[PDB]
Amino acid sequence: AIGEFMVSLPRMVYPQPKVLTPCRKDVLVVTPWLAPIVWEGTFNIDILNEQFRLQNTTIGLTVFAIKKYVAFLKLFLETAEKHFMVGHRVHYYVFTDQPAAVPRVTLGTGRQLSVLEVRAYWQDVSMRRMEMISDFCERRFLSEVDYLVCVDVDMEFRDHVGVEILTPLFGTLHPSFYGSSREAFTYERRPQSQAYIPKDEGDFYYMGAFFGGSVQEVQRLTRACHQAMMVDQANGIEAVWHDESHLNKYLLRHKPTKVLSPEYLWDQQLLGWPAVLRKLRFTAVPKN
């Protein structure tokens, strides 16, 4: 449950936070709109686990595995079982055109998986994830989970991804652009697109492969992006990076209440393991 009466935390013994000692001096840990940017060292997971378990939090995880991408499900789900929200209630929603190709993955207690069949297939395909999350699953998600997390399938968990990410609305810093100036961001730059962002605007470049929030906020985001993509289709334009371009426009105009660092979306083959990353949590798998 979100927003409901919160019982007291129990007594806990942990290191005192010290006002004159930053957790991290090498990175920005809060946005200019006072949203935490989540890096290792910024959170005490024991405190957060307590807070979220006291609310009996349920997290939904959506993932699409259409056509050949069903091959990625086994590693995705098996590593999610090792690293994603362990100890919390989790409901996986696997959207696929091949229900029989979903691997039988053994789940920990308090965790469940639903296979949701969708159509095979390009413009309706580009809008598929945003449309599916909003238009068709609206009522189900509201009844079943407190938060939704929406990720790419061509990925594996290598380390902890937990309740530190949960908040009304979050996006994730794209691993290729976190050091870039805004003029270099690959936002949609054509004013004829609903995703248009001028060269003097932009906070961050968020990747389309990991976003989430409360069910209400995720449905707001996905509905807005779906509607904007439909306008573009009607006007004969497709944004340069498809749903990611629209996600970036949305998060510019509706600031996220947390931002995940690139620990949460990394490609080691492409980008190595820089000093600023203490953990590589959720990482690209080769898709050639």
Rounded Cα gap, residues 52 and 281, in angstroms: 20
Tell me the CB-side half-sphere exposure of residue 51, using CA atoms within 13 A.
14
Q: Which of residues 114-153 bind ligand URM (CB under 6 A)?
A: 152-153
Q: Quickly list H helices, 94-242.
A: 123-126, 128-131, 138-144, 215-234
Whole-number Å distance between alpha carbons of 138 and 89: 19
Cα separation of 160 and 162, whole Å? 6
Tell which one of 63, 173, 207, 280 touches ligand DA8 (CB under 6 A). 207
Q: Which CB, 24 or 182, lies closer to ligand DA8?
A: 182
Residues 181-210 that bind Mn ion (CB under 5 A): none
Residue 175 near which of ligand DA8, ligand URM, Mn ion, none (CB within 5-8 Å, type-dependent): ligand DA8
Stretch that binds ligand URM, among 59-67, 115-123, 215-223, 258-266 (CB under 6 A): 59-67
Span 266-285, contacts to ligand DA8 by CB under 6 A: 267, 270, 284
Provide, rounded to whole angstroms, the least separation between the CB of residue 73 and Mn ion: 13
Q: Could you tell me what percentage of the chain is helix, strand and coil, using 3-state DSSP and rounding each to the nearest 5?
A: 35, 20, 50
Cβ count within 10 A of residue 86: 16
* Interface positions, 268-287, toward ligand URM (CB under 6 A): 287
Whether residue 37 is annotated as binding a ligand: the answer is no
Answer whether 282's CB lies under 8 Å from 210's CB: yes
Q: What is the closest distance, in whole angstroms, from the C-beta atom of residue 248 to a copy of itself in the complex?
A: 14
If one asks whether residue 152 binds Mn ion (CB under 5 A), the answer comes out as yes
Is residue 244 part of the annotated active site? The answer reads yes
Active-site annotation, residues: 244
Binding-site residues for UDP-N-acetyl-alpha-D-galactosamine, please? Answer: 64-66, 69, 152-154
